[PDB]
Amino acid sequence: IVGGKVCPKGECPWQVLLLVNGAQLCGGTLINTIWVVSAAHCFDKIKNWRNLIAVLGEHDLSEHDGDEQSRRVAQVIIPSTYVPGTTNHDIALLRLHQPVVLTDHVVPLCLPERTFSERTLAFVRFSLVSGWGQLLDRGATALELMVLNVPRLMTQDCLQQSRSPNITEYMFCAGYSDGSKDSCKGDSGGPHATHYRGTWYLTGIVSWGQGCATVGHFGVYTRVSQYIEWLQKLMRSEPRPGVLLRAPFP
Amino acid sequence: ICVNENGGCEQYCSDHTGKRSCRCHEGYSLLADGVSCTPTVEYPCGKIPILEKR
Ligand SMILES: CCOc1cc([C@@H](Nc2ccc3c(N)nccc3c2)C(=O)NCc2cccc(S(N)(=O)=O)c2)ccc1OC(C)C
Ligand SMILES: [Ca+2]
Numbered sequence: 001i002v003g004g005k006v007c008p009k010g011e012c013p014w015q016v017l018l019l020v021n022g023a024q025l026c027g028g029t030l031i032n033t034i035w036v037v038s039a040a041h042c043f044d045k046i047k048n049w050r051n052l053i054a055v056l057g058e059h060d061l062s063e064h065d066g067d068e069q070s071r072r073v074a075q076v077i078i079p080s081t082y083v084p085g086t087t088n089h090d091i092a093l094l095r096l097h098q099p100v101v102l103t104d105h106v107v108p109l110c111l112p113e114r115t116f117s118e119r120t121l122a123f124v125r126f127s128l129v130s131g132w133g134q135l136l137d138r139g140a141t142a143l144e145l146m147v148l149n150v151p152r153l154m155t156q157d158c159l160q161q162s163r164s165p166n167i168t169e170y171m172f173c174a175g176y177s178d179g180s181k182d183s184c185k186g187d188s189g190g191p192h193a194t195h196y197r198g199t200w201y202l203t204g205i206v207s208w209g210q211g212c213a214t215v216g217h218f219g220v221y222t223r224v225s226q227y228i229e230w231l232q233k234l235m236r237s238e239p240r241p242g243v244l245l246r247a248p249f250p
Numbered sequence: 251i252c253v254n255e256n257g258g259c260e261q262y263c264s265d266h267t268g269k270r271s272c273r274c275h276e277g278y279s280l281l282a283d284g285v286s287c288t289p290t291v292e293y294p295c296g297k298i299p300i301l302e303k304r
């Protein structure tokens with residue numbers, strides 16, 4: 001996260017840290033006790049699927065305070081329409097091997113209904129983006145979870161305000177063109193959370209952009225409203241052997 | 251009518267003919283006003299406990 005602030009401990013309780021062999025891979029969002037929503041691109045280079053860990057209740061990477069809960073990722077579900085090395089359909093649904101325990105520090109973010117997300121949430125101007133990604137372009141990643149407030153743009157306005165992959169109906173722009181504030185590569189998969197009438201909802205996933213906080217460029221986020229039914233149907237399905245699952249989209 | 255101001259609903263809105271029904275995400279219940287959602291669980295989704303308990 002560029003130009004944000006530390007998320008005070010316990011104020012981003014749905015934030016997930018994805019690890020591969022103990023190394024920082026991506027972020028994610030907890031949506032209930034067993035399911036995590038992340039970006040499909042986070043898994044393009046995985047070879048050791050058994051080394052994939054999700055950490056909940058994480059805040060500061062330098063210390064263990066006892067609120068962290070780590071779980072093995074039993075399944076990574078990616079839409080059939082996602083093509084590795086490309087930008088479209090950048091979403092992954094992760095099944096944890098064992099449920100996490102909900103506490104003051106571990107709470108799911110609401111996965112909204114499609115209608116409510118399209119008709120209402122899509123019009124809330126500002127939303128929060130978070131992660132332990134780069135604090136600057138070509139800079140070090142954060143030790144404490146960072147949060148940033150970003151305004152959402154209409155796709156026409158984003159193309160007209162920008163100085164390249166297309167911005168599809170499965171994406172949206174959010175952020176600033178001045179080079180001061182953005183989510184970065186290490187934030188990938190993390191939440192874009194929207195507040196509405198006292199409750200926070202999942203509206204986007206940190207997906208892509210052109211370098212972090214680059215002048216004339218906005219952050220690009222997976223438009224989660226397009227996947228609500230895809231996600232819901234998968235959550236009601238029985239697990240299948242194998243870690244990686246490609247599921248038909250739509 | 252759900253298209254306009256979320257049909258007055260705090261969370262989800264369903265159109266029914268001419269008729270509107272508000273709904274809530276799991277871990278919440280709809281109040282008698284027919285619009286408000288109240289938590290039914292200790293850790294409802296999208297609420298920050300350190301902030302709620304403050
Ligand atoms: C769909 C992923 O697309 C991409 C992801 C990233 C980079 N992530 C991010 C995330 C949020 C950002 C933001 N808000 N602002 C600025 C830059 C940002 C970069 C990342 O993860 N890299 C490592 C990486 C992992 C896996 C596959 C591929 S890819 N798609 O470039 O082959 C890149 C960069 C370029 C991408 O696509 C190109 C084609 C424009
Ligand atoms: Ca820690």
